[model samples]
Each structure stands twice: as C-alpha cells, then as structure tokens.
Target: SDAPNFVLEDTNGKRIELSDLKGKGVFLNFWGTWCEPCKKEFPYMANQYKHFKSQGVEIVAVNVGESKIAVHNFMKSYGVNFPVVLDTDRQVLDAYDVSPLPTTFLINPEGKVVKVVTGTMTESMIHDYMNLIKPGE
Candidate 1:
C-alpha cells in the first residue's frame, strides 16, 4: 500500500505518474539490459502484456540506470511492446529499493503494493501473481 509516487519518462518522451493508474493493476519492474536474468524476463513480459493490457494491467518496466540505446538494442529481440521507461538516473531504483537484476512489485488497482518478486518468473507464475490484481481481490 501507499506505493511511492514517481514521474518517469517513457521511451516516447511521455511522462507517466505511477499513482495515476488508480483503477488499473500495475507491475512495477526494475531491470537492466546488462542483467542476465532480465534477458529471459522481457519476452515473457511481452506475452503477459498482450493478454492483460486491455484487462486493466499496466507493465511499468523500469530500466535501472541504462542508456536508451542499450535498451533499444535489448528490445530488438525481446520484442517488448509495453511501457518501457528509462531510469537513467536511478531515481526509481532508489525509491523502490532495487535488489537484483529483475525485481517486481505487483500493485493492486487500489494502489497497494501486494507483492514483491525478486529474480526471473515463469508464465504460470506470472498468471498466478495476477492474483494480487485479479478482479475480485
């Protein structure tokens, strides 16, 4: 609960306010292009995005202190069509207390931090994680 509010610019140069996704589930992910496990994470992320995106799920993939170019290169094969925000200054990283290459915060529609996951996740695990934001929660 009380997920710290922060404004970050997406790759398209649009500012996004985390707290504004009031009625939508938010997946706040901390990652880096250089992070190995992250390599495996993005593809699965894209899959989840395509399915739940219209169902009120937002994936805020935060690239922790990386250049836009690096992220672009990584995205080439990863095929992530979701909201990928560039955290060049580590502001978001520091705010959320990042621990590893891939960490995630599953936020419920009401803006509560329901779960914190560290390391890579599976497709089934991802679907299960949605329990935190499932319609009837």
Candidate 2:
C-alpha cells in the first residue's frame, strides 16, 4: 500500500529517513551525476522545490553510486534546493527497483505511491508533480 522505507545521508552529511517525512508529500527521485536527463531535470526540481517546500512537499533525491564531491559539485552547478541522499550501496535503488536515469516515485502525504515516472521532466511537469503531492491538495 505504501512505498518502502530508506535511510540515507544528504550531501550536507545530514541523515534522512523516509519514515520521518510522513504527513508530508515526498518526491523520491533516483538519479546519477553522469545522467544527462537527470541533469536536465535538476533545475526544474530546484525551482519547484522552492515553491513547494513550504507547502509541505519534500524532495529526497537518491544519487545512485556517486561520491560526495561529485554530488556536491552537481548540486552547486544546478542550484539544487532539495535534500539529496547518497545511495552508495544501491540499497535504496534496489528497494525501489529503480532502473532509469531519472526514476521518480511521487508519494502522497499519506505515504502512498501516486506515480512511478522515468525520464527528464519539464518545468511545468515538475510543477504539476509538486502539486500532485502537495498537502491539502
């Protein structure tokens, strides 16, 4: 009925656990630093996260097999605003069965899976997705 749980560290070295984010919209995205499509979506994600964060939506970007420095540089280059978690062991990746460059699990406030989308998302598409999981929507 609900998505599986995970605990991972953010780029800032902060620990983030999926269960702790209950009652808020969760954007669980799986990506890699070398992914071109993922690069395309980062800015869109950053812009939308700025608007939706206060609206009770959260983004947990899971970087698959990338190191701290690479992730840090990527975040800086893209001006990312959401929390990005490192899936170094590919544990979360396996749990979610992510297979694409940019696979996203849009989870609602109740922690239920709403969509499993893959590929590059446009600015408006990202906006629509944030709205899809925005609390009280």
Candidate 3:
C-alpha cells in the first residue's frame, strides 16, 4: 500500500505534515492513554527519540480517540518528549488501516512505509526496524 499523506494536529495544536518529515525517518505510532501496554512502551520510545535525534530520526506518536488533555497528562507523567498527534476522530488511524491498539509504522526517509507492526513495540523491535530503514546502525 502507498504511504498515506496526513496533516494532523498535535497536543499543543501544532500541525504536522508527513511531507515535512521527508528526507528523515519517522516512527509513526498508534496508541492511546488507557492502553496499559501502550503506556508501558512509550518511555522506551521517548528514550529512543532522545538517543537518535542527532541521527535524523523523528518519532510521532498518534494518540487514537483521546482528548488532548489525556494525551498531555500521559506525556507529562511519563516524560515523553516527542510530538504526538491526537487522532480524536480516528481519521488518520482509519486511513492507515490500524485496527489494533498499539500499531506502529516505520517510514523511511524516502516516504515509504517500510515496516508495520500491530502490537506493543519493544526497544529491540524498534531498533531492528531502524536498522532496516537506516542501515549501518
């Protein structure tokens, strides 16, 4: 399937376009505040963001069917520093055909959906995907 184009708003009402992140890898995650595993996996993601920012990698967590306040509180409590897109209406989630609670898509720098996972993602799992998108890690 072709990569879906999107322009969604984050918690702070900042608009993020997929095209804007082209030429840099993106870790697009579909999660929610209530999912236990989702909450557990976020800190690892946040750590990855801090460790890999200089490597031209970007992490965009898409909170599915949640309010900005819910998403904000989760980030604040967990210290998740990456930008999060609030998919309150599930527009983007449905567009990506994400049916599971913790789906994730690893998009390459060329704007291609290279890897897709439909469950909680571990740090090693993410690292494997990152290695695929950006070799020689």
Candidate 4:
C-alpha cells in the first residue's frame, strides 16, 4: 500500500511531510522516550547516521505524545541527531496503525512500505532492511 501522507514538525519546528521525502528511503520509527526498547535502538541509529546518510537514507524517529522537554532531553542522552517528529496527538500513530513502542515502517524511495517491524532492531538488521529499499542508490 502507499504510505499515507501527513505533515508534522521535527523536534524544533521544521515541517516534515511523508510524501515530500519520496526519493529517499525512510526508516519511519514510532517510539516513546520511556520505552526501554526504543532507548536501546536510538544510539545505534545515531551511530550509523553518517554512513547511511551518505547513502540517501533518512532515519525519522517519530516520538509518540511526549513532552517537548522530555523528547529533547532523551535525544541528547541518546546522542540522536537524526530527524524526529512529535506525534503529539498520535494522529500519525493511528494513521500508521502503530501500537507497539518501536514499530518501524521501512519505506522505499518510491514511497512504498517495504517492511514493518514491531520491536527493537539491531544495526545489522537495519542494514539488511535498507539494502532492500535503496541499495546502491
């Protein structure tokens, strides 16, 4: 199915729309600051940013209804510098049918969902998923 398009802001104030990023693979992660599994996955994400960013992949972490302060502090603690959107009302959450804390939608550059995982993902697992979406792009 085509990924639903919606506009949301990054942690600070940059407007982000799902459809606008169509040519780059999106690792759309729906998570919470308090979720242990999410905490575990973020550092690995930040660590790989430079490598993957060079390959045209975007790590978009969508925070699920957390206070701005909480999300900011958590991002600092995790050393996550990737794009983060606040799902304040969880409209994006329901739009994407996300329930589990670390649900991830791996969308190809063409804007199609290529994979969906409902738990923590290891770095190797993520590499494999990206290879499926935008390998050598």
Candidate 5:
C-alpha cells in the first residue's frame, strides 16, 4: 500500500511532505524522546543516514508529540543528521497506526511500503534495511 501522505516541519522549520519524497527511499521512523528503545536506535540511524543519503535514501524521524525543545535537544545530543519532524498532534503517527514507540516503515523509491519494523534495531539490522531500499535494487 501507498504510505499515508503528510506535511510536517523538520526541527529547522523546513516543510517535509511524504509524497514529495517519491523516487527516493524513505526510512519513516515513529519515535519519542522518552522511549528507551528509540534512544538506542537513534545513533545508529544518524550514522547510517550519512552512508545512505548518497544512495538515494532519506530518514524522516517523526517525533510523537514531543516539545520542540525536547526534540531539538535530543537531536543535538544524539548527533542526528537526518530530518526530524514534529508529530505534535500525532496525526501522522495515528495515520500510520503505529503502536510501538520506535516503529519504522521502509518505503521504496516508488513510495510504497516495503516493510514495517518495530522495537529496537541493531546497527547491522539498520544497515541491511537501508541496503534493501537502496535505489536500483
């Protein structure tokens, strides 16, 4: 199925739309500052984004209803390089029906969901997921 479309702002105030990311793979992660599993997964994500970004992959970290200050601080502390969106009302989170604090949707270049992952992910697992969505297969 097509991933639900949304328009949200990154911490930098840049507008991001899911549909606009078509033709590039998207690592759509739903998380919160207080979630332990999410805390563990972030550094891996930030580092992986550096390698994957040039491979036509983008990470969109969706913070579930956290304050801008909290999200900003978390990003800075974690050394996050990907775009992190504020899902303040969780409208987008609810749209995706995410039950886990650290759920991830792997969307292919065509904008279709290739996989949905829940819970904490090891660096190797995150690396492999990116390879799965790398452009040109």
Candidate 6:
C-alpha cells in the first residue's frame, strides 16, 4: 500500500495531517511510552528536531497504541517540543509496516518512503539520512 495518510490529534488536540505536510521531508517516528529504546533516542531526536525544523524538516512522532495521557506525561517529563500523533489503534503504524517499538521512516519531499530505520537511532544516523534524503541540504 501507499504510505498511509493520517489526520490525528496532536498532544494539545491540534489536528495534524500527513497530506498537509506534503512537499517537505518528514521524519515519521513510531514509538511507545514503555519502550526503553524509544525513550533513549527521544532526547536526541528532539535536539535534532529543533535544529532541522528551521531548514523545513518535519518530525511526526506517532505513539503506537498509547493513551493521550500516557504520551502527554512522557512528553511533559521529557520536555519534547515536537508535535506527536496519538496512534491509539496503531493504524498508521500498521500501514507503515512498523512491528517494532521504535521504527522510523524518512519520507522524502516527494512523499515516498525513502528510508527505514529500527531500534535506537542516534543524532548522527538522523543527520546521515537527512543528507541523503533532503534536497539542497
């Protein structure tokens, strides 16, 4: 199937849609509050998020099968500033073929699934993908 389109509520109940962000590179992250590795990589991702967003990069964190409260608590404690989608039914996760707790897809500007990474991802790894996928970077 094609990359699934999503119109989910963010942590603050703001509507976010994949289609709306078209023409920009998206870092679609599938994570859960209980996953240790997901927790481990979040801070680095947040840091990198702040840096790259100015360059027109978008980061969409999808919390797999987790409650809004759980995700809210985690984000509050971690101080994550990026927007997150509440994937309570795991629909988006399933469409993206994400079986693991911490799976990430780097979607290019053309909305194609250009790269996939699983497990704990580092800042350098994200930068490598950015260099490869992002145009004029």
On lDDT, the leading prediction is 5
Choose 2 or 4, whichever is better by lDDT.
2
Q: Compared with the true structure, what per-residue lDDT tens digits does model 2 show for residues 1-137?
A: 69998889998889898999999999988988888877779988998888899999999999998899999999998888889999999988998887876899999989999998886688899899989999973
Model 2: pairs clashing at backbone N, Cα or C within 3 Å: none
- List per-prediction Cα lDDT, in the order shown: 0.83, 0.89, 0.82, 0.85, 0.91, 0.80
lDDT of 5: 0.91
Candidates ranked by TM-score, best first?
Answer: 5, 2, 4, 1, 3, 6
Model 5: CA > 4 A from native: none
Candidate 6 Cα errors over 4 Å, as ranges = 135-137
Q: Quick one: best TM-score, which candidate?
A: 5
lDDT of the structure predicted as candidate 6: 0.80
Q: After superposing candidate 3, which stretches have Cα over 4 Å from the reference?
A: 135-137
Candidate closer to the true structure by TM-score (higher is better), 2 or 3: 2
What TM-score does structure 1 among the candidates reach?
0.93
lDDT of 5 at 9: 97
User: Any runs in candidate 1 off by more than 4 Å, and if so which?
Assistant: 135-137
lDDT of 5 by residue, 5-92 (tens): 9999999899999999999999999999888776668999888888899999999999999999999999888888889999999999
| Clash number for each model | 1, 0, 0, 0, 0, 0
lDDT of 3 by residue, 40-136 (tens): 6888877777767667788888999888887888999887988899888999999998887788888888889988987767888776666665522
TM-score per model over all chains: 0.93, 0.96, 0.91, 0.94, 0.96, 0.91
Error of 4 at 10 (Å): 0.3
> Which candidate do you rate higher for TM-score, 1 or 2?
2
lDDT tens readout by residue for model 6, 56-134? 7788999998888889899887768888989879888887778877888888777788878886677798767665555
Clashing pairs for model 5 are: none
Error of 4 at 51 (Å): 0.5
